[PDB]
Each structure stands twice: as C-alpha cells, then as structure tokens.
Structure 1
Amino acid sequence: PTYPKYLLSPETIEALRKPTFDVWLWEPNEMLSCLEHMYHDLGLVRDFSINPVTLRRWLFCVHDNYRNNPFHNFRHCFCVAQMMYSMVWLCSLQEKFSQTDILILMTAAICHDLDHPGYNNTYQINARTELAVRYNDISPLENHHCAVAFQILAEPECNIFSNIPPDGFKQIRQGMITLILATDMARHAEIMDSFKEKMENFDYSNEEHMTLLKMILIKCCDISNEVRPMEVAEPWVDCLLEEYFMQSDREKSEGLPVAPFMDRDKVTKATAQIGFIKFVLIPMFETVTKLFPMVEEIMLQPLWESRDRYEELKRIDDAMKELQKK
C-alpha cells in the first residue's frame, strides 16, 4: 500500500541528488532516513564497514544535539549535508576525491553546527561567555561544534567509525576539524584568498590544494540557501533574521556592541541578501565554477536571479519609504 514516511519513494531518492530538493517538505524522521541513505548510496557504509544500526543511532544523537534556534537548527544541518550530497554528484566529486575525503565532507557538513546556541562568536567573545573563555576567543563556536561532534563519536553506540583502523580515524578527525573550523566567517576573506592563490595553477595531486578545495566546498554548502529555488530559500531569510535579531536585542539590552547588519531597526529582507549575494556568494561560486564549469548553470544561475530579484525588491522598499514623507 502507501508505505510509511521513513521509506523513501524512488522519486525522493532521485530528487535528493539535486539542489532543487525541497528541504521544507520533510520531518526529522525522513531527513534522518534521507541522510542514512546518503551514506549507503555514497558507498561509505560499504567502504568503511559502517554498522548500519550504528549509523541510525549516530544520526538520532546528532539530531538531538542540534538546538531549536530559528536558523542554526537541524534543518540547516540537513540543508548543508544535502547540498554537499548534491555537489558530490554535480561535480563528479567521487572521481576527484578519495572515499575518505567524501566521508569527511559529509560527516563534516552534518556535524558542523552542533549545539549552536543561537549567537555568533562576536557575542560569545564580547559577552565573555563560558565558551569564549574556554576557547580563548579563537573560533569558539566552531571549536565547540567540533568538540561536540567527537564526544558523540566517542560513544561506542554512536561511533560510525568503530570499524575503521586508527590511522584512518586519525586522518578523518584531522580533516573534519579543519573543515568545521573553516566555517567561521571571520576567516572567509583569508580562506578565499588562499584558495584563489592555488587556482592560479590548481593541482588535484597537491594535498594542500585539496584541503582548501574541501574547505571551500563546505563553506559553499554552509551558506548555500540562496542557490536553492526562490520558494525554498525565501523563508530561510526570515529564519536568519529572526536569530540575528535575537542576538542584537540581547546585545543592546546587555550594553554590548551591535553589528549594523543585524540591527532590527536597519536591516530589511533585501538589504540582508543583496550585499551577501553579490560579494560573498557569487565570487565564491565563480571560483568553484573554474574547477567545475557545470556549477555555473545550476548554482550561479539561481544566485544571479536572487540578486536581481532582491535588488528590485529594495528599489520598491525605498520607493515606498520615499513616498511616506513625500
């Protein structure tokens, strides 16, 4: 008959390889089954002898350790892993990367925002939170996510790596750490430049060129909302701003500095996205497109449209303002 929801129709399994996938349709159960399938379909369960019963418990534990913030919640976790999935196929990555690196990318994506409390490192630092004091103002959140991720994998029951050798686990841990830490936006400028310097003369042989490439990929996935179709990506803005406004109120209310780009009184749906798209997103994917030309049409495409769409929407917001003292 109609089977249960956590059994995916081949139609789903098919549509899950795509960035056009609607992340909003599904509920935890199914997102978890979705992710679980990702690990079989990518040959990770086979090639690392992952216990399939462990793989489920891992994902339940991962889900539980994500918090219910407006933005930095399990669905974001899902989007990023799903987008990494989408790009494994789009960029034929399984050719260019070892199965270990694929495992790192996927596992990294999933774990990258674990137990995120809802307020960025600038709050953590300026408010001198336990986490800021603990990690000494060095990417405290990302360091924290990373820590949480491996606390989980240290449990025998959640340890998807339990049947990996120690030399392999070492190498995987080192890689996830690198990537998760790379999600810090303070380091965007820095990482983009290092990447852009290797792109002068890229070399898939070179381990350091590849490390950057992975860092770039996970960053691409971390902020990829606007690559998704307008209908899927429009509400995320309200989720982001809901969280960013939570922090700015708290910051105001505790006498702490307040970033203009998170200010309830200044930011509008459009002004949030235009600059972010034009100058962070596009230039990033522009470089990735050089390594992978197919990315232009799938990813830059929606971004240009989303740019245009918001740039206009801002003209109208401003036209309206102007009218209300004209």
Structure 2
Amino acid sequence: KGHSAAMDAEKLAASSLFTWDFDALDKSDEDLTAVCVRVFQELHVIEQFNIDEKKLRKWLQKVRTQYNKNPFHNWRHAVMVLHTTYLLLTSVATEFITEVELLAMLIAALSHDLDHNGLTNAFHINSRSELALVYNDQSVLENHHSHLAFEILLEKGCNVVENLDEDEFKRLRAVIINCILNTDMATHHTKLSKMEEVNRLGGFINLAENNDQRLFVLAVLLHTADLHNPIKPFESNKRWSARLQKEFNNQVELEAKMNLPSLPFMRGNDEESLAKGEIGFINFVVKPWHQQLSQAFPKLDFLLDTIDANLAEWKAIAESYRQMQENLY
C-alpha cells in the first residue's frame, strides 16, 4: 500500500555493488551468487516481502541449473542483465516504480533467457521446431523463457513470491510476462517508435499514476539491460561479442546440416567480421535507441559516451583490416 518503492538512489549508488564496469566473466560461481543476493538485499525487497532467504538461494540455484553452457546466452549473461537492471532502475526509476514491480524486474532479468540453446527465433521457425509448434511462431524463445520463469518460481521450495497477495502477484506476473516478451528483438523497432513519439510530446508525464505507460518504461529498461555489450568497457564489449559470434557460427553450421537458410551476417568467424558487425549494430540499433532513451532520461546520457568510445574502437580495428585488404587490389 505504497506510492513508490522504498529506494533512495544516492544511498544505493554509494555501495560497492554500484559499478557500471561490472562484468560477470571476471567473477567466480560463488561471487555471482553473492551479487544476486546483494541486489535483492540492498534494494530492500527481501525485507519488504518477508522473503525466505533459503528459498531465494534455492531459487537462484534452480535458475542457474536451467541455463545452458552457451558461449553467450548463459548464467553469466543473466547475472549481467540482473545487475544492469539494478543500475538502470536505481538511476531513473526510484520515484515511480512500485515495490512489487521492483521485485518483478529482478526476477524477470535473471529469468529472461532461461534454457536458451544458442539458437535464434528464426532457426526455430525455419526448422519447425517443437518450440515453434507450441508457440505458433510468436516470440518462440521469449514465450519459452517466461513459461520456465514461472515453472521454476511457483515450485514450493523456490517460491520467493509466496507472501504476495492476489493483486500483487497479478501485477508481478503481468510485469514479468510483458518485459520478457519485449526482449524479443523483433519488437525493438515498435518500442523505438513509441519512445520517439513520447519524446516529441515533451516526455513522460506522471509515470507514478499511468500504469500502462510505466510498464512500457520497465519493458524499455529491461531491453536496455539485455543489450549490455556496447555500454560496458571495451574489453567487456569484445569478449561478449566474440562469444555471440561463436553462437552465430554454430547456428549457421547447424542450419547447413539441416538444409535451412542462413543469414549472411552470421557467417563471419574472424576479428574483421566481428568489428564490422559491431559497427553496424551500434550505428543502427544501439545508438539510435540510447539517443531516444537519453532524451527521456537525461541522467543516462553518459552511456552515449561509452557507446561512442566502443564504436571508435571497433572502427579502428576495421580500418586496420581494411588497410591490409585494400593492397591486394
């Protein structure tokens, strides 16, 4: 029965947990567990919902065991999205997000890629996979992730939301479903267009009262945290991007063995292809997204300087390879 969640951003930002340079690749298994628990603890959701910390840790374990050992879409990617969501909500959402929606964003971020196998939605649709048949080609993977999120959560020993009442769980369920389904890259352009129209009209007006407009912002922020590669230091940008390229190469190899069409961008398997793909992805997807995001939330415009520094680095790598490839001609 509160107006907004119990958060003071400046106390939260003073913690050693608050660092935009966080990279799960440099953390051990026990370190990642501590990060997830610390996010829940420092955001006060454990005490606000009387969360059994034995169920929280059991739920965390069950979440990790349902992620697969993929190069990119793995348990460390989930923790990266959880931690980045914690950074984004602390920066801009402290005064309109509710307590239940805050708990929902933490669960959704950690659960958003459950049981990923390093294959894209196009593979499932083209191969007519069992998952594609279940979901009738509609956001196949994201529907699968959200389903397993609740199958794991509603289990008795992992029920971290056991103390929520009917109305609170209904809102938590709606927030998790909408935010995970909006991690589908096929819905990126629609959210970008709506953000542009909102920015044309001056911006968001009283988010604490407009429930549907507040949910849109939460979906926008989780999608932002999902694309964490270009907003991290370049060493983090390069290691994760090289891991995604490995998944792309494995899919093309599987698609050829199954006589399925492949997209030409996924075929590149060297450093020059990596840099060229990152330049295009940043110039046409990430940068226009954060330009609209920084206009609605100017506190986040420092991310544009991180995106530009990484973009300048990838262009230096591409220029070196092109300078070596032009001499053949």
Distance 1:32 1:273 in 2: 31
Q: Comparing 278-287 with 215-224, which one deviates more in the overlay?
A: 278-287
* Structure 1 counterpart SS, 2:68: coil
Work out whether 1:286 is the aligned partner of 2:287.
no
Q: Is the 8 A contact 1:16 1:86 kept in 2?
A: no
Q: Is the 8 A contact 2:192 2:292 kept in 1?
A: no
Distance 2:188 2:293 in 1: 15
* Structure 2 counterpart SS, 1:14: coil
Note the alpha carbon deviations across 1:151-200, whole angstroms, 9 max, x for none. 01121100100111122111101110000000000111112112322333
* Structure 2 counterpart SS, 1:321: helix
Length-normalised TM-score, structure 2:
0.91
Within 5 Å, which residues of 2 pair with 1:105-144?
Answer: 105-144=105-144
Match of 2:89 in 1: 88
Q: Is the 8 A contact 2:195 2:293 kept in 1?
A: no
Q: Is the 8 A contact 1:65 1:114 kept in 2?
A: yes
Match of 2:32 in 1: 31
Q: 2:273 aligns with which of 246, 268, 271?
A: 268
Per-residue deviation, 1:15: 3.4
Give every structure 1 segment of 4 or more consecutive aligned residues whose post-TM-superposition deviation is greater than 3 Å: 264-267
Per-residue deviation, 1:245: 0.8
Per-residue deviation, 1:312: 2.2
* Structure 2 counterpart SS, 1:15: coil
Match of 1:43 in 2: 44
Gapped regions of structure 2 (runs ≥ 5) = 1-13
Match of 1:4 in 2: none
Match of 2:215 in 1: 211
Note the alpha carbon deviations across 1:235-275, whole angstroms, 9 max, x for none. 00110000011101111222111111211369711112011
Per-residue deviation, 1:96: 2.4
Per-residue deviation, 1:283: 1.3
Match of 2:320 in 1: 316
Per-residue deviation, 1:102: 1.4
Q: Is the 8 A contact 1:114 1:148 kept in 2?
A: yes
Q: Is the 8 A contact 1:271 1:314 kept in 2?
A: yes
Distance 1:208 1:167 in 2: 16
Aligned length: 311
Distance 2:17 2:237 in 1: 16
Match of 2:165 in 1: 165
Q: Is the 8 A contact 2:113 2:145 kept in 1?
A: yes
Q: Is the 8 A contact 1:104 1:175 kept in 2?
A: yes
Q: Comparing 39-48 with 21-30, which one deviates more in the overlay?
A: 21-30
Q: Sequence identity of aligned pairs in percent?
A: 32
Q: Comparing 82-91 with 259-268, which one deviates more in the overlay?
A: 259-268
Per-residue deviation, 1:211: 1.6
Q: Is the 8 A contact 1:248 1:264 kept in 2?
A: no
Distance 1:269 1:60 in 2: 33
Per-residue deviation, 1:53: 1.2
* Structure 1 counterpart SS, 2:298: coil
